[PDB]
Design a protein around this ligand. Sequence first.
Ligand SMILES: CC(C)(C)OC(=O)N[C@@H](Cc1ccccc1)[C@@H](O)CN[C@@H](Cc1ccccc1)C(=O)N[C@@H](CCC(N)=O)C(=O)N[C@@H](Cc1ccccc1)C(N)=O
Lengths: 99, 99
Amino acid sequence: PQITLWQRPLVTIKIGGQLKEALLDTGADDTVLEEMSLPGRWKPKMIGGIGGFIKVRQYDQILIEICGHKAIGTVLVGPTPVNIIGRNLLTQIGCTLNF
Amino acid sequence: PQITLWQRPLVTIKIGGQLKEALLDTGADDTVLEEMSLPGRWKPKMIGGIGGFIKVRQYDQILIEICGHKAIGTVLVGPTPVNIIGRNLLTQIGCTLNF
Ligand SMILES: CC(C)(C)OC(=O)N[C@@H](Cc1ccccc1)[C@@H](O)CN[C@@H](Cc1ccccc1)C(=O)N[C@@H](CCC(N)=O)C(=O)N[C@@H](Cc1ccccc1)C(N)=O
């Protein structure tokens, strides 16, 4: 699909059996979701953005579906104010910026 | 042009006759630039990102060129980790997300 940017590019995603709303963020290296449980081992990580850093749990090899497109990748879980789909998964669904 | 996301979508912008590097950020409502000098009066604004909020100076109707595309809009100046081009200006240059 072609997503305009007049409004925030919010999409529904499916992960760990849950449907969630997430922001497609080309300015995010990683995908960060609000607190939730995920399977497998995880390791701590510190990620930053506007306002500073937050500590998150890093899970690898997580399956996610965004607009019918299935992807596999690392997913960070922590006190993020919004669910964010970063470049690590945007590439997998073939998402590009165009103008 | 079409910009893939295997790497950060960093581009060259021109503001105040000077070239700077900036990140095309679809997850950002606004455009935030690192400390620099801009003309006119500014208004106060508090913006929130991944690790909290920061105070910035808001300048309106500022001329800024992005990848050769001219835009004139609101530019926020403050302690941002990197120069961010948000939706307010991405829309002016006709940018969309596609997959
Ligand atoms: C700019 C503005 C108007 C304040 O909006 C946001 O910050 N919006 C953010 C989402 C949001 C919206 C509303 C409320 C809360 C949160 C996000 O879209 C901004 N995109 C980038 C902006 C950016 C880019 C580079 C540097 C600083 C800031 C981002 O946060 N990116 C983070 C996302 C988290 C992540 N882990 O991917 C990122 O790429 N961080 C990297 C790079 C990094 C390292 C160290 C410091 C800063 C940034 C990282 N590995 O931590």
